[PDB]
Design an enzyme around this catalytic site. Sequence first.
Site, PDB file in Angstrom:
ATOM      1  N   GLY A 257      51.532  16.139   7.884  1.00  0.00           N
ATOM      2  CA  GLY A 257      52.583  16.755   8.371  1.00  0.00           C
ATOM      3  C   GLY A 257      53.199  16.283   9.534  1.00  0.00           C
ATOM      4  N   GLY A 258      53.734  16.817  10.316  1.00  0.00           N
ATOM      5  CA  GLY A 258      54.336  16.157  11.558  1.00  0.00           C
ATOM      6  C   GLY A 258      53.696  15.245  12.243  1.00  0.00           C
TER       7      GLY A 258
ATOM      8  N   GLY B  78      51.712  13.295  10.919  1.00  0.00           N
ATOM      9  CA  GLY B  78      51.463  12.120   9.920  1.00  0.00           C
ATOM     10  C   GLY B  78      50.394  12.306   8.828  1.00  0.00           C
TER      11      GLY B  78
ATOM     12  CD  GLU C 145      33.941  12.084  18.570  1.00  0.00           C
ATOM     13  OE1 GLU C 145      34.389  12.947  19.084  1.00  0.00           O
ATOM     14  OE2 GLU C 145      32.727  11.733  19.064  1.00  0.00           O
TER      15      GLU C 145
ATOM     16  CG  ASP D  26      41.742  24.481  10.326  1.00  0.00           C
ATOM     17  OD1 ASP D  26      42.728  23.752   9.610  1.00  0.00           O
ATOM     18  OD2 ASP D  26      41.585  25.770  10.096  1.00  0.00           O
TER      19      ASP D  26
ATOM     20  CG  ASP E  45      50.794  22.576  18.856  1.00  0.00           C
ATOM     21  OD1 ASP E  45      51.283  23.688  18.881  1.00  0.00           O
ATOM     22  OD2 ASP E  45      50.774  21.651  18.162  1.00  0.00           O
TER      23      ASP E  45
HETATM   24  F1  LIG Z   1      37.182  16.197  10.841  1.00  0.00           F
HETATM   25  C1  LIG Z   1      38.577  16.290  11.383  1.00  0.00           C
HETATM   26  C2  LIG Z   1      39.322  17.062  10.655  1.00  0.00           C
HETATM   27  C3  LIG Z   1      40.732  16.997  11.090  1.00  0.00           C
HETATM   28  C4  LIG Z   1      41.110  16.112  12.144  1.00  0.00           C
HETATM   29  C5  LIG Z   1      42.789  15.812  12.615  1.00  0.00           C
HETATM   30  N1  LIG Z   1      43.016  15.199  13.703  1.00  0.00           N
HETATM   31  C6  LIG Z   1      44.242  15.299  13.958  1.00  0.00           C
HETATM   32  N2  LIG Z   1      44.903  16.185  12.801  1.00  0.00           N
HETATM   33  C7  LIG Z   1      43.640  16.530  12.131  1.00  0.00           C
HETATM   34  C8  LIG Z   1      44.126  17.208  10.779  1.00  0.00           C
HETATM   35  C9  LIG Z   1      43.677  16.777   9.584  1.00  0.00           C
HETATM   36  C10 LIG Z   1      44.019  17.564   8.524  1.00  0.00           C
HETATM   37  N3  LIG Z   1      44.843  18.903   8.380  1.00  0.00           N
HETATM   38  C11 LIG Z   1      45.401  19.268   9.539  1.00  0.00           C
HETATM   39  C12 LIG Z   1      44.996  18.283  10.723  1.00  0.00           C
HETATM   40  C13 LIG Z   1      46.379  16.067  13.042  1.00  0.00           C
HETATM   41  C14 LIG Z   1      46.523  15.239  14.297  1.00  0.00           C
HETATM   42  S1  LIG Z   1      45.164  14.868  14.910  1.00  0.00           S
HETATM   43  C15 LIG Z   1      40.266  15.129  12.586  1.00  0.00           C
HETATM   44  C16 LIG Z   1      38.929  15.113  11.944  1.00  0.00           C
END
Ligand SMILES: Fc1ccc(-c2nc3n(c2-c2ccncc2)CCS3)cc1
Length: 268
Positions: free
Chosen positions: A14-15, A17, A84, A91, A130
């Site tokens: 997404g935005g 990256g 990490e 989420d 955010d």
């Molecule tokens: F175990 C994990 C799951 C997601 C993340 C994660 N960390 C970030 N984003 C995401 C993310 C990954 C997948 N879909 C949405 C957000 C976006 C910017 S910083 C990190 C560790």
Amino acid sequence: LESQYQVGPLLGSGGFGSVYSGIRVSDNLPVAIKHVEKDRISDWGETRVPMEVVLLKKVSSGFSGVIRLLDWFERPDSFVLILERPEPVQDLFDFITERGALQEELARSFFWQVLEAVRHCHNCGVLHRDIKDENILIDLNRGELKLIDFGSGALLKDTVYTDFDGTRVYSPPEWIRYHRYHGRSAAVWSLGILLYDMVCGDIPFEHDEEIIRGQVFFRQRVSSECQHLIRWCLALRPSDRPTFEEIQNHPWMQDVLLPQETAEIHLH
Ligand SMILES: Fc1ccc(-c2nc3n(c2-c2ccncc2)CCS3)cc1
Ligand SMILES: [Ca+2]
């Protein structure tokens, strides 16, 4: 980079990256590998790096409810961030979508942890900008919540902000009306939106007009104490909003569960 980390499946894009699941080769530590193209970067800091790197470094020292930056790399056309990765993890957006509106005991634990995490950022001189369900990860085994995505963040200051690239439905009425907001009070507003989202299973405002009207309607049974806290956080006047101390001293916030206790009761 390619020698130190073993790349797995794409987690999302997404935005922010593109984020891949990954493993650190040295010790099999689960990691997330985030790629972002240089030309897509809007905010730079300092070695010239994305502001995100600057912010993450400021908050990644020691333990916290923030996903920590383990390492980073510069490529000719991109930056690569090593973060990490909890496992198993989900989420807050997916969790709420899946389970619906949360019991207040569970919402209390989650919201408390988010507050502690945001306090950590602010104490480290970092404003997230955010705060929302999508940017909160749940360590399902430990019941610990972790903040992600500082890509829209900024250094914390006491003067006015005139720029914003966070989520609009979480943005305060002063931003909508005047394109002006102050960090802490704007954060509190977004926390009000978040808390409503937890206990109602959806956000309270969709349109700009609803945001600036600031009238909160509850679609789920929510305690009067919790309703009061939400409406306080969502005060139209920024100065009428509670401090973090006032939120955590609020009657609804008392007797919070421990993270592990939260997991045993609500997650396991
Ligand atoms: F175990 C994990 C799951 C997601 C993340 C994660 N960390 C970030 N984003 C995401 C993310 C990954 C997948 N879909 C949405 C957000 C976006 C910017 S910083 C990190 C560790
Ligand atoms: Ca939402």
